[PDB]
Write a protein that binds this ligand. Sequence first.
Ligand SMILES: CC(C)CCC[C@@H](C)[C@H]1CC[C@H]2[C@@H]3CC=C4C[C@@H](O)CC[C@]4(C)[C@H]3CC[C@]12C
Lengths: 55, 229, 339, 253, 217
Amino acid sequence: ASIAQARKLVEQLKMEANIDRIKVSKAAADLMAYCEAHAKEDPLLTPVPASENPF
Amino acid sequence: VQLVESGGGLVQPGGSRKLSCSASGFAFSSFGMHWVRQAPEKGLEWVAYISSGSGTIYYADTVKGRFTISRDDPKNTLFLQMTSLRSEDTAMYYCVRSIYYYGSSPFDFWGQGTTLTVSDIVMTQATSSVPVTPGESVSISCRSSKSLLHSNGNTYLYWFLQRPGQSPQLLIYRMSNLASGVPDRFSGSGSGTAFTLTISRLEAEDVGVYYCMQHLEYPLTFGAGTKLE
Amino acid sequence: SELDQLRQEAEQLKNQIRDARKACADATLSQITNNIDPVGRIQMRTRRTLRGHLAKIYAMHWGTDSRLLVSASQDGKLIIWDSYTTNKVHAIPLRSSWVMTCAYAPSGNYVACGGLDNICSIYNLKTREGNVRVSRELAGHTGYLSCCRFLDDNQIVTSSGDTTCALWDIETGQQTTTFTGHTGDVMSLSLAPDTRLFVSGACDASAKLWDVREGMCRQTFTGHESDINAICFFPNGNAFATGSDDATCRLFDLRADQELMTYSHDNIICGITSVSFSKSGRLLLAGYDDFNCNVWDALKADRAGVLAGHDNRVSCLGVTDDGMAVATGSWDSFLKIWN
Amino acid sequence: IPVFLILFIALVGLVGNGFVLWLLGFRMRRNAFSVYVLSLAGADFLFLCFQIINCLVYLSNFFCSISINFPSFFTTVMTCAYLAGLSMLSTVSTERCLSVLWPIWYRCRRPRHLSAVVCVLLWALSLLLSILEGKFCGFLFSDGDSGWCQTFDFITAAWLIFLFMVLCGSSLALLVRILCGSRGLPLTRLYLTILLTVLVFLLCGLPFGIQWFLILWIWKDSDVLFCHIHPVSVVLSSLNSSANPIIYFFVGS
Amino acid sequence: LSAEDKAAVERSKMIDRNLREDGEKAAREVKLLLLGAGESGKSTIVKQMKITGIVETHFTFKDLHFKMFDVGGQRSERKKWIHCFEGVTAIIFCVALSDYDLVNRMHESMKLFDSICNNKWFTDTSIILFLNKKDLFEEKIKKSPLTICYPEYAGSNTYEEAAAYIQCQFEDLNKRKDTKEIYTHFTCATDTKNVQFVFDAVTDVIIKNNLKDCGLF
Ligand SMILES: CC(C)CCC[C@@H](C)[C@H]1CC[C@H]2[C@@H]3CC=C4C[C@@H](O)CC[C@]4(C)[C@H]3CC[C@]12C
C-alpha cells in the first residue's frame, strides 16, 4: 500500500539526512581554484592562434 | 571475410584473360579494391585501383591502356581484363580489400591470389636478408625518395608480411598503427623518409618476406623485399 | 492513522535537511568570486557546418579523440562525422525514427541511441565486415529514453520516461541495477569523470546524485520551478549544472549540498534544452529555444557570449575533451562547430 | 526621362535578382520549384544589366557624346534573356496548376529532374529563337534578308501569344478548382496572387514583346513609336523584371 | 588532399547521395498520429486501416503511403514528446460514442481534445475525428438519457439529434476554427468508408502543402 511507499520515503530521507556537508565558502573556493589552475589549457577562454587551431 | 580469385592458367603472348575475384563475408559495396602483382622472384608491384561505387579508377604506368578493372556491386565480383599480354606479366596477382575513412585500415585483407604465366616515389629495402636468432629484437629499415609525412599529419607507410606459401597481410598501417589480429611484438617507428619496423621477442610463424608500401600518391610502390632466415 | 505520522516523520526529516543545509551557507559563490577578473566578450565563429540531416536533430555526442562526433535525427539516421574535414564517416539507419538520445563510447567502438521505442540500441563501429550493425537491443524500460551514456564498452546507464534510471551490462542485455526515486519522468543524465557515480534530472524539478556500484540515491537537489531538461558535470566532479523550463540554469555542489548560483536573465522567458561546460569549467554553454546558445561565465553569472547561428531551437550541444571546439546542433537540421 | 527611371529600376532589380541568386544558389536547400525561381533570376539579371549597358551608352551620348557602337549580338542575348524570363513565368503557372489539379502525382510521382530538363528545353528554345532572329534580321556579324526577318519575328511574337494563353489557361483552371472545392486554403491571398501575376504578365511584360516584335511590321510609322512607345514600354518590361524577385521569392520566403 | 583523403571525400559523397535518396522518399509519405482515450475503438480503426512504446502501422491506399503512429500505450508526460510529432499530416482522434455514461468518460475525451486541438505544436494540423460506436449508442439512447453527461442539454433523444450534439460539443472546443480543419465521421465496427474519409481529408492537406511548395503559402 502507501505505507510501504511512505516507509521507503522515511528510509531515504533518513539516510540522506546525515551527510558530512562542507561549507559553501570552501567549495566555492575549490571551484575557483580549479578554474584558476586550468585556464591556460582552455582553448575557448583564450582563443588559440590559427596554426595550432585545427578548425 | 573471403576473397577468392579465379582465371588461372598459362597463356600465349598477345593473348587475353579475364581474372575474377569473388567476395563474401563483408560489405563489398563499400570497399575500395586493388590488384597487386608479385613476380615469382621479385617483390610486390601495384596493378590497378577501383574505388567505392566505381567513381575513381587508377592504373599503374606499366599497365595503363592495356588492363581494365570492373566491379559488380550486386553480384560481388571484381574483374581484371587483360589484352596484349607481354612477358612482363608472368606473375601472381592478389586482390586487395581497402577502405578509407578516418581511422580506417586500408590494405588489411588480401586474397589467396592467382597465377598467370605468359609463355614516382621509390622504395629501398635497406637490407635484403637478415639472419635471425629467436627471442631477440629485430630492426628492419626502409627508405623512400620523397617525404611520406603529409601536411595533415599522416605518414603513408604500410608494413606487410608474406609468410612462405601464404598470402601477404597487413602488420602496421600508416607507419605507426598496429593492425587488428597482429600482436604487440610488431611495431613501427620512423621519421622523414627513414623507417624502422621492430619485431621484439620474435617467435615462430614470423619468418617470411617483409614489404614497405606507400600510399601518399599514385602509383603505389613497394620495396624489394626483406627475408628473415 | 499511522501513515499521517509517517508523513509527518518525512516532513520533520525534510525540515532537518533544510535547516542542516541552511547551516552550511556562510557565503555565496558570488561573494567568493567577484574580486577576480571577468572573462570579457566571447566571440566564437562558425568554423564548420555539417549539413546532411533532413529533420530535427535531437542529440549529439563528441568523441574522446575530439575529431569524431555522432548526431541523431528524426529521419532515422545517426551520422558519424569527421569534424575537421566535414566528411561523413558513417551513416547508420535506425529501426525507429523517434530517437531522442545518442551516445558515443569512450573507446570509440560503439554508439548507442534511443527514443520513443523504449529501447537503447547499441551499434558496433569497428566491425570486421565493414558496415555498422546492431550489437544490442536494451529493452525493459517502459518509458521513452531520455539519455544513454557509456561507462565502458560493457556498461551503459540509461534514463527513461518511467521515472527510472538503469545500469545495464551490454553483453547479457540485463538491467543489473535500477535507480528509482523520481516521481516525474527523468529527462537528463550525466556521468562523473571517474565514472563512480552519476547525476540525473527529472520533471520533479529535482536532480538526484546516484551511485553506480551500490545502486541507490545519495543526495537530492531541489530549487527549480519546472521540469529540468539538461544536466552536466563540472570537470572536477564536485559540482554540476542544471537547466530547466524556468529560463534558469543552476549550479549545485555534491559536498556542500546546496544551490550555488542561478544563471538567468530577464530577456529569456523560454526553456533550456542542453548544457555543457568548458574544459576548465570557467564558461558554461546553455542551448536555448529562443534559437541561440548562451555562453555564461560560470563563476560570475555574466553573459559572456551568444552563439546565434541557428534559426530553430538548439536541441543539443557539447564541448570536446580537448576543449578545442563546441558543436551545437538544432531543430533546423544543421550542426555548427564553433571556435 | 524614361532613361533615369529604367536605370533606377534596373539597379534595384539587379540587386534583388543577385540576392535571389546567392541565397538560393549556395545558402538554402533547393526543392523542385525553386529551380524555376533561380533560373528566372538568371534570365532576368542578364536583361537588366544589358539595359544598364544600353542606358549608359544612350546617356553618355546625351552629355559627353561618345556614341559607343557596340556589337550587335548583345541585343540578341537580351532577347534570349527576355524570352526565357517570360517562359519561366508561364511554367511557374503550369506547375501550380498541376500541383492543385493532380496532387498525389505532384507529391509522389513527380520525377526528381523534371524542373531542370524543362528549364533546359525552354532556355534552348529561347536561345534558338534569338539566334534565328539575329541571324536573319541583322543582329549578328553577318546579315540576312529582311523579307525573311519578319517571318521568324512573327513566329517569336506568336510564341509570346502562346505563353500568354498558357498562363491564362493555367491560372483559370487553378482558380476554377480552388473555387469548386477547397477547405483549408487561404482563398483571398490565392485569388489576389493569381490575379496579380496575370496582371503583371499582361500589362508589364508584354508591351515590349508586342512593340519590338509585332507592331514594327503592321504599323509602318516610326514617327510616334521609337520616341514615345519604345522607352515607356521598356520601362514597363523592366518593371516586370524588378517585380519578379519580389513576387516569386521574397513574399513567400 | 592526399590519395586517402580523396577516397574519404568520395565515401562522404556516396553517403550524401544515399541520404538525399532516403530523405526525398520519406517526404512523399503521409504521417498520421492516432490519439484517443483507452478503449475508444482505436484497435478497430487499425483493423479497418490495415485491411512497446510506439506502434507504427504501414498501409497503402490509392498509390499513397501512410505511416500511422499509435502512441497511446506509452503512459508518461505527454508534453515532453508531443513536439516530436510536429509536422504530422493529420491527427486521427478516436472517441467512443457508447462510452458516454460510463466512468464521466466523455469529459476526459473532451479534455484530451481540448489539450491536443489547442496545442502550440498542432496549431495548423488538421484533425480527423472518428466517433466510434454508434450502433451501441442507439441502444443506449433507447434505454438511457443523454443528461448524465450534459445537464445543459435539451433535445430529442432518438438517434440523430444526440449524435449531432456530441459532434458540435467536440467542434466547439477549439479557440481557433479558421486555422485548422476538423473532419468528423460516424463509424461502426462494420463500414468500409473510413479509409476513404482519411484519404479525402489527407488530399486537402496535400493540396495545401503543394501550394506551399510552389510559393503561395
Ligand atoms: C543549353 C543552354 C542554353 C543552357 C544554358 C542557360 C544558362 C544561361 C544558365 C543560367 C542559370 C543556369 C541554371 C542555374 C541553376 C540550375 C539548377 C540546377 O539544379 C539545374 C541546372 C540549372 C537550372 C541551370 C541551367 C542553366 C542555366 C539556366
